[PDB]
Design a protein around this ligand. Structure first.
Ligand SMILES: CC(=O)O[C@H]1C(=O)[C@@]2(C)[C@H]([C@H](OC(=O)c3ccccc3)[C@]3(O)C[C@H](OC(=O)[C@H](O)[C@@H](NC(=O)c4ccccc4)c4ccccc4)C(C)=C1C3(C)C)[C@]1(OC(C)=O)CO[C@@H]1C[C@@H]2O
Ligand SMILES: Nc1nc2c(ncn2[C@@H]2O[C@H](COP(=O)(O)OP(=O)(O)OP(=O)(O)O)[C@@H](O)[C@H]2O)c(=O)[nH]1
Ligand SMILES: Nc1nc2c(ncn2[C@@H]2O[C@H](COP(=O)(O)OP(=O)(O)O)[C@@H](O)[C@H]2O)c(=O)[nH]1
Ligand SMILES: [Mg+2]
Ligand SMILES: [Zn+2]
Lengths: 412, 426
């Protein structure tokens, strides 16, 4: 029934504090109410401390807040092997101590930031140690994969080609939200050149609320977590769909809010609104899980979608007749009291697997090579319990992820 | 986390006074007083530079190494001079001769053990050690020789903790000493092989940047020092503050050093406007990157425009949009694709603290790893040969128990170091 969550890496923790905020906010549980149902991991104390100093301070147990005073290191190796190792046990312990206390759970919603040290590496083995300790569950990892041109870390790809290959054979469904492609939404669909990280977080903090929160919440067309991976992954590769939200209108500027279904659903497939720089440049969808929430008439959907199924310029895979999982919830969304999110009475958090990422992975793989081609910051990992193996052998890994996402599509 | 500063030589020392003059105020620590901190955040992370004893006396955890009493006895007899626990003063009343050899093999080699002693008392302080800060000048005895030894020993004692080095590489135009390239070439040698992050500053790159970027007409040393100390505060201490995207020595190290040499950077501060007038506030952000990335404004002597970059780290510290930050950096990376090296898709390492420099609204330290610094070790290396060839003031070295193969060694080494760096400019 439940779904634990492990927010790993400063980012996964910032986003965590955010997604965790939106929660109580739409459940009437102020600062000090019940008890969360997740944990927080980081090898840099000062960040988890922010959850220990700032807002939502006492809504957590100093037990579900793991820290390694030591060093973060923007390098996979160190975070996965060398350092990150020391903490893992302890980490697990909570996701085994928190996993027990419950009643027939469904899985762990993992929150990490692909291209980091504590986020890429660590998790790599966290999800790793999970796939074995609970192979019998769902492993949906919600990632924030590398901005297409606006990356931060100098190594980023090293850290992301490595978190992909190690987690690939362990996740159930990996959701992806592109940090940059979300900015566009903040520039083009909300207008603000002042987007603090605290915003992107409010956003995913939204799209995510549509996943677990409301879905695990009764409705006219419930959709379990398992449901996802089933209706969402055509193949064992921990396939990565993309998150998209519909009413991303500004709560100040424009106001046409009352945008009946027929509109908000069409607003999902236009590439300028998908929290991912993977513009459907060719990527044929192969399965979409349209999660609606608020006042929505099933016919409105079983029509708004029909209209789409016949737009053709939206070309769905061949081997897939119908790939539209319609998830209907009741309670409308719940916008921050005064952030910058419109606040409509219905939304569409549609996520999907698109042959599109054939790109995004490509463009991120290429990156890697360029540097590896010169070993660049390699000495930083080797000296951290890794080898020419793990790199070269994780490169070959993704290689067959560029072929995979190619074969499962583009062909009939 | 933590670090333990090291004031090698007079310069490195003189600067200590300025690095601590600053940092303290950037942490509300009065002479011997405690934390008067205008805020409450300038305290949760202080440890990085102090120690708890009394309850109002957080003492800087640095080392003051020097073979010339008068110096430390000027730093200890002035302003903040009375905050260092006397135990910190590792003096060498000997003749602090201006010979690299006199402070690395003969005179300094003795005072070393009585230093390492303390560098251990401070390291084994508490919590977890990160690395050590090292200030000095590569143009003298107590600086290049004895300080370059202090590290060769440090890096044998904790090849784990990092080693940032702040070197005052011999300014071009005019040398404030004569053997300079001797004391220098010999210390850079030791650097390229122990510390793993070096920030090279040039007394004349400063003047310039201090007489034209600060209409300042009488730039006393105190100033130069002050400007420098401003950068080393943005680097370390800063990142030991919160931030949307914070880093720390390692991130800085693990994002800036593609190849083990250690490589040297060139620090640059952001708001560098003259007092009254200039107080233009054009600091939205494009103004800071405008600054940081220009030629002038690079504490180094060489000009970036004269050689690609391998890595860059804009360590900003003042509330800004992870969008207008992450964005700007890009155009910058495209307007100058020419010089920014290609085999690194994203050279730049954007870092973002929150709280800014006490009295300012928005700043951003720049730590550049450009291939341009090739054209400096060249300089140094040249000066050597031109004088080595004739063994100029060599008797002051050998006569101090040195080797004719020692000088050969260093030059070559550091000389090769020039070579390599070009391997990327191409
Ligand atoms: C009324 C007002 O706003 O005054 C400003 C000011 O006029 C200007 C010109 C300051 C001023 O700085 C200088 O004139 C300067 C003198 C020698 C060497 C270098 C700089 C200032 O003195 C410096 C001072 O800086 C700080 O307070 C920072 O926290 C800074 N502190 C120190 O350097 C410091 C100085 C003395 C004692 C202890 C610390 C800092 C910067 C980075 C990291 C840590 C601390 C500031 C904003 C000002 C004055 C006071 C006029 C500027 O410099 C800095 C470092 O902020 C010079 O260009 C900037 C722009 C500022 O607006
Ligand atoms: N959406 C979003 N992205 C973030 C946030 N914080 C960081 N990121 C992104 O995630 C990556 C940064 O990872 P880091 O913060 O460097 O590292 P980490 O993953 O926390 O772990 P370490 O490297 O060990 O510190 C970059 O690509 C950032 O753009 C956040 O709050 N929200
Ligand atoms: N920025 C700066 N440079 C200094 C200071 N003092 C000496 N220098 C420089 O250091 C070099 C001389 O070395 P010195 O410090 O006297 O050596 P030592 O004292 O024998 O170790 C010259 O290039 C000077 O410009 C200072 O307070 N600030
Ligand atoms: Mg972190
Ligand atoms: Zn309307």
């Amino acid at each position: 029934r439940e779904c634990i969550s492990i927010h790993v890496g400063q980012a996964g923790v910032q986003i965590g504090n955010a997604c965790w905020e939106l929660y109580c906010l739409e459940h009437g549980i102020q600062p000090d109410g019940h008890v969360p149902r997740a944990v927080f991991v980081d090898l840099e104390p000062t960040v988890i401390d922010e959850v220990r100093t700032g807002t939502y301070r006492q809504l957590f147990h100093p037990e579900q807040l793991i820290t390694g005073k030591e060093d973060a290191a923007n390098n996979y190796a160190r975070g996965h092997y060398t350092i990150g190792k020391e903490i893992i046990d302890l980490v697990l312990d909570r996701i085994r101590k928190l996993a027990d206390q419950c009643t027939g759970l469904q899985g762990f919603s993992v929150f990490h930031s692909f291209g980091g040290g504590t986020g890429s590496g660590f998790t790599s083995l966290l999800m790793e140690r999970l796939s074995v300790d609970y192979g019998k569950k769902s492993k949906l990892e919600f990632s924030i994969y590398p901005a297409p041109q606006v990356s931060t870390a100098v190594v980023e790809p090293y850290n992301s080609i490595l978190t992909t290959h190690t987690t690939l054979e362990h996740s159930d469904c990996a959701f992806m939200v592109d940090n940059e492609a979300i900015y566009d939404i903040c520039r083009r669909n909300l207008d603000i050149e002042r987007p603090t990280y605290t915003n992107l977080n409010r956003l995913i903090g939204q799209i995510v609320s549509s996943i677990t929160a409301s879905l695990r919440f009764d409705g006219a067309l419930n959709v379990d977590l398992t449901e996802f991976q089933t209706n969402l992954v055509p193949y064992p590769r921990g396939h990565f769909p993309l998150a998209t939200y519909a009413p991303v209108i500004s709560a100040e500027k424009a106001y046409h809010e009352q945008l009946s279904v027929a509109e908000i659903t069409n607003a999902c497939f236009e590439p300028a609104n998908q929290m991912v720089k993977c513009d459907p440049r060719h990527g044929k969808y192969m399965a979409c899980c349209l999660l609606y929430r608020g006042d929505v008439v099933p016919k409105d959907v079983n029509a708004a979608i029909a209209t789409i199924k016949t737009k053709r310029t939206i070309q769905f895979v061949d081997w897939c007749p119908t790939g539209f999982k319609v998830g209907i919830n009741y309670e409308p969304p719940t916008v921050v009291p005064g952030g910058d999110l419109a606040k409509v009475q219905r939304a569409v958090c549609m996520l999907s697997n698109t042959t599109a990422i054939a790109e995004a992975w490509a463009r991120l793989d290429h990156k890697f090579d360029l540097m590896y081609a010169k070993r660049a910051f390699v000495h930083w990992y080797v000296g951290e319990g890794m080898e020419e193996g793990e790199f070269s052998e994780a490169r070959e890994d993704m290689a067959a992820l560029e072929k995979d996402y190619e074969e499962v599509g583009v062909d009939s | 986390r933590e670090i333990v500063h090291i004031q090698a030589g007079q310069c490195g020392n003189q600067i200590g006074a300025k690095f601590w003059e600053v940092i303290s105020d950037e942490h509300g620590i009065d002479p011997t007083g405690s934390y008067h901190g205008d805020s409450d955040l300038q305290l949760e992370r202080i440890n990085v530079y102090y120690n708890e004893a009394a309850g109002n006396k957080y003492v800087p955890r640095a080392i003051l190494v020097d073979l010339e009493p008068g110096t430390m006895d000027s730093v200890r007899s002035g302003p903040f001079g009375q905050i260092f626990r006397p135990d910190n003063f590792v003096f060498g009343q000997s003749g602090a001769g201006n010979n690299w050899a006199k402070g690395h093999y003969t005179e300094g080699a003795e005072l070393v053990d009585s230093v390492l002693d303390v560098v251990r008392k401070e390291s084994e302080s508490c919590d977890c050690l990160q690395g050590f800060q090292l200030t000095h000048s590569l143009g003298g005895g107590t600086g290049s020789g004895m300080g370059t030894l202090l590290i060769s020993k440090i890096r044998e004692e904790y090849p784990d903790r990092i080693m940032n080095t702040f070197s005052v590489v011999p300014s071009p135009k005019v040398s404030d000493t004569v053997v300079e390239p001797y004391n220098a070439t010999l210390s850079v040698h030791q650097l390229v092989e122990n510390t793993d992050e070096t920030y090279c500053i040039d007394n004349e790159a400063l003047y310039d940047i201090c007489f034209r970027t600060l209409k300042l007409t009488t730039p006393t040393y105190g100033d130069l020092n002050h400007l420098v100390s401003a950068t080393m505060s943005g680097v370390t201490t800063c990142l030991r503050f919160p931030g949307q995207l914070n880093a720390d020595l390692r991130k800085l190290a693990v994002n800036m050093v593609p190849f083990p040499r250690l490589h040297f950077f060139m620090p640059g501060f952001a708001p560098l406007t003259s007092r009254g007038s200039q107080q233009y506030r054009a600091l939205t952000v494009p103004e800071l990157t405008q600054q940081m990335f220009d030629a002038k404004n690079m504490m180094a002597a060489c000009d970036p425009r004269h050689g690609r970059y391998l890595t860059v780290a804009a360590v900003f510290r003042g509330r800004m949009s992870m969008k207008e930050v992450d964005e700007q950096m890009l155009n910058v990376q495209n307007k100058n694709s020419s010089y920014f090296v290609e085999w690194i898709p994203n050279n730049v390492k954007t870092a973002v603290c929150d709280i800014p420099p006490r009295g300012l609204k928005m700043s951003a330290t720049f730590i550049g790893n450009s291939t341009a610094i090739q054209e400096l070790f060249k300089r140094i290396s040249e000066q050597f040969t031109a004088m080595f060839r004739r063994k100029a003031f060599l008797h002051w070295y050998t006569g101090e128990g040195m080797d004719e193969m020692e000088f050969t060694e260093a030059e070559s080494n550091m000389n090769d170091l020039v070579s390599e760096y070009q391997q990327y400019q191409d």
